[model samples]
Each structure stands twice: as C-alpha cells, then as structure tokens.
Target: EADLALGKAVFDGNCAACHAGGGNNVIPDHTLQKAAIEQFLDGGFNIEAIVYQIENGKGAMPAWDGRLDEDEIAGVAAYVYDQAAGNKW
Candidate 1:
C-alpha cells in the first residue's frame, strides 16, 4: 500500500479541481455519478485502469502520463479507490 498522506496530497493537488468534495467533472451532468464509482470499486481497482485514464485522458480531463511520476499516479489511484469506497484517505 502507498502512503495515504501522499496519496491524498496528490489527489488534492491534481484531481481536486474536478473530483473535489467527492465528485468528478468528467462524468456527464458534472455530478458525482454513483455508477462510475461502483465500476471502479467492483473491478478491484487495478492500476491499469487508473494509468490508462491518466495517460489517455478522458472527457474534461487531461492526460498526465508524463506530468506525474509512477508513484504519484499510484498514490492518486489509491486515494481515488479509498474515496470511492467511502473511506477517508
């Protein structure tokens, strides 16, 4: 497992603008879609999904494959999983 504090920091810095207050901007309607969160959690949250999304980018989201290191990306992924699971990261 990664450092929860570092994960939270990376998420707050790079993801909070859109995924702030437990919501994402990429989803339709600009609201936190429960279905989306469920998908990630149910899939066991593999790193590939997270890395692909960050590298290829998504709706209203930019690619950060090169911008962030592997550790940072992993940390953010961990944070995302925790948040999606309703756990405070």
Candidate 2:
C-alpha cells in the first residue's frame, strides 16, 4: 500500500506548483477533484490512473519517471486519489 504521509510530502514539494489543493493551475477543467478526475482522467479516478499520469505526464505536465523514485510517484498518486475520493481538497 502507498504511504499517505510520504505522499503528502511528495505532493507538496513537486505537484503543488501545478496542482495545489487538488486544483489545476494550468488546466482549470481538469482539477484533482473526484468529479473532474473521473471525467477528465484517461483511466478515470483511480490510483493506477494517477500513477500512470505521474509517470508519463500529459500536456503541460512533465513526466517524473526518471526524476522520482517508484515509491515517490506511487505515494503522490495515492495521495491525490485519496484526497479526491475523500473530497479533502
């Protein structure tokens, strides 16, 4: 399972610039909110989908495959999905 604590740290350091509080700075419509993720995300609102996107990136987003470790990516993905699913942001 993904470590939520590590996820939070990773998110704050890397993803916050573009996606703070589950909101998308570059693409307003593609927010990290559950509804937006389900409709806009390629694989829907799931951890796997989030991980894939983090690893491969899309549009204005940059891929973290080489820069971040596997666990870091998974952590952030889990954190995003958890936040969206829980409506935390």
Candidate 3:
C-alpha cells in the first residue's frame, strides 16, 4: 500500500529540510541512517518505528499526524525504512 515514489516526494518536501541524505541536522548523531536509526529510534529501525515517530514526533522533530494523511505517512515511513535497510542513502 505504501508507495516509495510518493514517499520520496513527501520526504523531499517535508523531512529533507532537517534530514537530508539520511543525516539529521537537528541532532547529528540521531541520523536516519540504518545504524543510527536502529540505535535511536524508540522502537528500533523498522517501518513501524519510523511511522510512529513521523506521526507523533520526538525531541526536536515535529508531529506530522495531522499535517499529513495516513497514506502519506505510511509511504514516507516505508521509504525511510527501505533506504536505511537497503543502505540506499
């Protein structure tokens, strides 16, 4: 159900402001890279973990729950997980 292409668009438009190239400008150590995501994401590097964070936000991040629709959130989460897991970033 999650479209990676759409996710990329969402990410480029919203998340890339702070997390471009899988790196976090707000919190450098907590990058979106696979290992960092695994170490820092509350639920550990997975699609669900990314989704929850995108929906609720954490620390310096802002919640996207209402700003984005479920499909967009799911798509972005899938894109992020895939990038980290596949080392595509």
Candidate 4:
C-alpha cells in the first residue's frame, strides 16, 4: 500500500540526517550506523529489531514511540525490511 511511501517520507525527513543517502553515513569504517537495504538482505538484521529500536531507541537514536503512531512505525518497519531483506510486497 502507501505505507512504503509514508515510511520513505518519514525516513527521509527524520532519519536521513544521521543515516544519510543509501544509509552511508559518515561513520567509522564507512559502515552504516544502522541497517541498510543490502545489509538486511545479507541477514545482518531483521524487521522486529528495527521496530523495537524505533520504539525504544538506542545510542544517539531518539525514540519514536511518541512521535509516530503504530501504523506509521509498522510502515517504516515494513519499508526497511523490504529494502534490507529484498522481500517484495
């Protein structure tokens, strides 16, 4: 559905600052600070983890628990999982 679009918009507006283009943020070893499409496909991470992280947050990552609704969070999780895990809708 439009979840992916909503997620992409949300990510670009809120996440791209740290995550950067294609998730290639200027971090050590040039690695993505968080999971990327390719990394997810390689089994580096999972959707549940992403969802939990967004809800609870981690180092430097602010919590989205209050900022985003469940559907929005689920949309973002789905978008990330699809991109990372190479799963088609």
Candidate 5:
C-alpha cells in the first residue's frame, strides 16, 4: 500500500493541478477517463508510456521528467493506471 499512498500523494501534488481525479483541466479534449485510456491501453498501457508522457509532455502539457524523482514519477504513473483500473481518487 506504500506505493499506492505515495502514488496518490504524488498525484495530488503534481498531477491534480492539471488532472484532478483523472480529468484534465488544460485539455478538455484529453480527459483521462478510464474508458478512453483503456481504449488506448488495450492492456498495453504501462509505466513506460506514462513516464514518457511525463518526460516528453504532449500538446499543451509540459514535461515533468526532471522535476520529479524516479519514485515520484513512478508514483503518479501508478496512480493514473490505478484510477483508470477502477481505484478512485
């Protein structure tokens, strides 16, 4: 549960600013709804893709690769997947 706790903490701190409860504030077109993510995930979504998105950013999103530690990055990644998988904020 440590991972989930830390992950939620990470999510609340950084991601929540933009993606509160898996919902994107910046890009209404890119809400992190489980349905949409699952469609893209199709069982292939993993840390790499999440990490890359954080590190590389996308569209209106900025890269957070250097701002966070490995654990923090992994934490948010896990949080996203967890939320998408059914766990709530």
Candidate 6:
C-alpha cells in the first residue's frame, strides 16, 4: 500500500493533470507537504482523507473509485505522502 514508486506513476497518470507540480492543492489546506503524518497518517495527515476525497470527489473533482482500482488509489495516497515536505510513509 505504501509504495511511492508506483504511487508516482499512478498519480501522474490520474492526478497530474490537475494536481501536478508538488504538494496537494485539490484539498486546499490538507496538502501532503503541509499535513503529511510525521510517522503515519494517524491523526496528522490522514492519507485516507485523500483517498476518500478521490473516491467521493468534491466540487469540480470527479470520483475515481470507479475508474482507478483500489491498489491504484492507494498508490496515489502513497505518492502524496512521499511527496510531502516532512512525511514518513
């Protein structure tokens, strides 16, 4: 589930279009670089929140649950955490 390598690829394929460059913006304040969990996404930066948003979507964003597989979604989460400024898987 925590594979930034694959996550990067998956993110680029599915999320780069809108959320490219670095850090997370699609969520406004809860960005990887700004909220990534120091150890894990326990109470700091819940990658689950990212996955939830991706799956459920918000505003202009569309749901990816039907398009990207579970693993792929996880990859995106992993990639986000890895890309953060101070994250730790």
Best candidate according to TM-score: 3
* Candidate 4, backbone clash total: 1
| Best candidate according to lDDT | 3
lDDT of each: 0.65, 0.82, 0.84, 0.61, 0.69, 0.64
For all predicted structures, in order, the TM-scores are 0.70, 0.89, 0.92, 0.66, 0.76, 0.66
Candidate 1, lDDT over the whole model: 0.65
Count the clashes in each prediction. 0, 0, 0, 1, 0, 0
Error of 1 at 5 (Å): 1.2
**lDDT (Cα, tens digit) per residue for candidate 3, span 1-89:** 59987989989989999889888787877777788887788888778778788889877889999977989989888887888888898
Worst 10 residues of 2 by lDDT: 50-59
Candidate 6 structure quality by residue, lDDT tens digits, 1-89: 75777777877767776667553455544334644344323345567776776687655567888977888788877677666744442
Please, what are the lDDT tens digits per residue for candidate 2 over residues 1-89? 57988988888979898788888788877778888888787888777887787788767889899876888888888888878888888
* lDDT (tens digit, per residue) of candidate 1 on 1-89: 56778877887778788888667666644333344644643333455676667666655678888876778777777667666556552
Give stretches of model 4 more than 4 Å off.
Answer: 24-44, 87-89
lDDT by residue (tens digit), candidate 4, 57-77: 655467899987787788766
Clashing pairs in 3: none
TM-score of 4: 0.66
Which prediction has more favorable lDDT, 3 or 6?
Answer: 3
Task: Compare candidates 4 and 6 on lDDT and give the better one.
Answer: 6
Whole-model lDDT, model 6: 0.64
Better of 1 and 4 by TM-score: 1
